[PDB]
Amino acid sequence: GVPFLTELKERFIRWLDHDNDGQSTFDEVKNYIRRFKPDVTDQTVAAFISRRDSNGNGAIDFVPEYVHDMAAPDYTLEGANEWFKLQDTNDDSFVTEAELVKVAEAVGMSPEEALDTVQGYYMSADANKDGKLSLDEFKTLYSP
């Protein structure tokens, strides 16, 4: 569906551009990802910016880039993999229940809200019940 542009802006400010200058520069994207992957590498942060940076100015611009990306959200494996990798705190190519719960708490959920999100919705994709998601399990969460 179509997002509320005013909410997109409030989200962009609160997550990526605290100063509302219209750009999310390196240290801003890093402070964003560090909330939930505290030992995120500088190169991960750079690749996140590059997928969004259509004008090549090394920054995520609210306009046109954030609005373009968010106005028409769509599924791709590459896009799903980016969030998978950011939740894979130990980079072992699985997201465990505990990693997903810690990320949920880090982005502002209470302990019980985080547990109920992960143990309900996320683990519904755990086809072999081993307590963790592969990329192939995780990607199914985009098409309930």
- CB of 81: closest distance to Sr ion in angstroms? 13
Q: Is 55 in the site for Sr ion (CB under 5 A)?
A: yes
* Torsion sign over Cα 107, 110, 111, 115: negative
Q: How many residues of this chain bind Sr ion (CB under 5 A)? A: 21
Q: Does 128 engage in binding with Sr ion (CB under 5 A)?
A: yes
Interface region with Sr ion, contact rule CB under 5 A, candidates 1-9, 48-56, 66-74, 106-114: 48-56
The Cα 125–Cα 35 span in angstroms is 25
User: Which distant-in-sequence residues (6+ apart) come within 8 Å of 58 by Cβ?
Assistant: 25, 26, 49
Instruction: Tell which one of 44, 97, 102, 135 touches Sr ion (CB under 5 A).
Output: 44
Instruction: With contacts defined by CB under 5 A, name the span among 4-12, 75-83, 107-115, 120-128 that binds Sr ion.
Output: 120-128
Question: Interface with Sr ion by CB under 5 A: which residues?
Answer: 17, 19, 21, 23, 40-41, 44, 53, 55, 57, 59, 61, 88, 90, 92, 94, 119, 126, 128, 130, 143
